[PDB]
Design goal:
Chain B: One of its GO terms (biological process) is regulation of transcription by RNA polymerase II. Chain B: It is found in: Cytoplasm; Nucleus. Chain B: This is Elongator complex protein 1. Chain B: Its main location: cytoplasm. Chain B: Belongs to the ELP1/IKA1 family. 2 copies of one chain form a homodimer. By secondary structure, chain A is mostly helical. Chain A has one domain.
């Protein structure tokens, strides 16, 4: 004599009378309906429907009714509570679609929800539409959306600019986004030396140098770019000795399913270093260390040529300047 | 009775007498070896070897000798004309490798040659190493390498900066390189309103706004970014109508129609990241409805695409939660 389907069906037409009939004539236990149907009858229609819909598990529908109760232009602590509890932010958002002041209330609780699930970008956008900018900036930060953060920081919190910049620079650096981190050092902390050093870890010697020159700090060409070229040189040289060293050795091994996969991974690491070496070769030429330029370009073509015994490959963009 | 290999091999050892011997025993025509053997004897040993090398066609060895005729004096005009005629810039570069002064002479002729064969970058790098910065800049500009160009116009030619900047912008723009062009408007012409507009044209509303804000010209938000968000909205909106309109017809309907429906699946994936930026730009400007429609319309397509592609590799659209309802 458990609760049956006809009882539930009737309740879902919002017909308490028909649902009484059904319960009585289905031998359902009065200890499991009369109190409820009593409570149902003691409520106004809107709230009665809410309770029904809640009971039946139709939470979207429940939310709709509940939000029709208060005809003052607000969103009640009840609606807010019911939305958090049943994860109904999207529906709430759709409900209040044509009432912006109300919609904003769901937006505010959603951003909090979004934020704590580490969806920081959406949290940030939402807070920002609500004009809650300290919270938006904070979330753009955690998203590592630095342009969005600094944009709020410069316009609404200029006294926070340095702090946010420093923090963003620290996490952009850790994420190896050196060009982004350098942009901030230049433009927001007015740190030219630091910026130039960072464009160099990105192999953007072209940028680093135009920056030290536009800043009217020509000395950084020798203080910073040059040593960075030295570093880039050494980092790429040793890598090419390492590749020729592993390839010459891997041939005199296959003479082991994994040996033939290590070679294919060296091709991937190579093709990834390629854009950087091109930049190293050109930065080396433009600073007249042309023997070092020559060596880098040769050693690369060499290893690339040696991938003829490959029993796929790109060509290395030689610069004619150092091709002899 | 015909010039032969033995005579040439002997010439190649720089032995005129053994050449003479070989030539006559082999009964070659005296008119085709005597006037030439004479000229070798009429010249100095180093030039002698040069002419021999020219004749056999070994132009690399030729220059080697001809470049030893003057030492340790500088590069002769004889050596230069010989490089431009037999294209041994690379080889000239190799001989003069340990002597920087001389190598520099070969770089100057190489640069001109490069810059005549459209290779403007290598041309510029050469010119830059030679302190010929005016020439370097022009070649960087031809190569659309604007950062190298301004780096020179700022340090050595301050009067020229506004004219290169303006010229480059014009190039870059036609090349559809809107962000680059904008950077120049911003940094070198102090034209903030223009840089902002261009950033928008590249769907980079994020750079657009931060530039307006940083420049302390907030009005450009309403003045430029907003209408740009309008343009971006309508362009992507109309495009999505097309795809829905296209497919729905191409669905009903040989080898042609099926390949053009595969061209949409790439025009969409091309348009997706820009769509995102438009959706995200719209939300930040509080245009929720417009944002919502773009994201719906886009998803609508990808879903419809996900069905009928089978009945004929679709990557889903990155939604923002702000406008997913």
């Amino acid at each position: 004599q458990d609760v049956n389907v006809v009882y539930k069906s009737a309740l879902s037409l919002y017909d308490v009378s028909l649902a009484l009939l059904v319960a009585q004539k289905s031998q359902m236990d009065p200890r499991e309906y009369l109190p409820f149907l009593q409570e149902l009858q003691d409520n106004e229609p809107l709230r009665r429907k809410f309770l029904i819909d809640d009971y039946l598990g139709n939470y979207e529908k429940a939310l709709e009714h509940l939000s029709e109760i208060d005809k003052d232009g607000n969103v009640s602590e009840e609606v807010i509570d019911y939305v958090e509890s049943h994860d109904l932010y999207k529906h709430g958002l759709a409900l209040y679609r044509y009432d912006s002041e109300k919609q904003n209330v769901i937006y505010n609780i959603y951003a909090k929800h979004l934020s704590s699930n580490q969806m920081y970008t959406d949290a940030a956008v939402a807070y920002e539409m609500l004009g809650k900018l300290k919270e938006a900036m904070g979330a753009y930060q955690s998203a590592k959306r630095w342009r969005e953060a600094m944009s709020i920081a410069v316009q609404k919190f200029p006294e926070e600019v340095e702090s946010v910049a420093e923090e963003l620079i620290s996490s952009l650096t850790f994420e190896h986004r050196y060009v982004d981190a350098a942009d901030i050092q230049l433009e927001y902390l007015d740190n030219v030396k630091e910026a130039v050093a960072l464009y160099c870890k990105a192999y953007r010697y072209d940028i680093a140098s135009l920056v030290a020159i536009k800043a009217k700090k020509d000395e950084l060409l020798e203080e910073v770019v040059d040593p960075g070229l030295g570093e880039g040189f050494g980092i790429i040289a040793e890598l090419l000795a390492d590749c020729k060293g592993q390839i010459n050795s891997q041939l005199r091994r296959l003479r082991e399913e994994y040996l033939v996969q290590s070679v294919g991974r060296l091709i991937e690491r190579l093709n990834q270093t390629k854009p950087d070496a091109v930049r190293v070769v050109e930065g080396l030429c433009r600073r007249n260390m042309r023997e070092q330029a020559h060596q880098i370009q040769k050693n690369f073509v060499e290893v690339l040529d040696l991938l003829k015994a490959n029993v796929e490959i790109h060509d290395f963009p030689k610069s004619h300047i150092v091709d002899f």
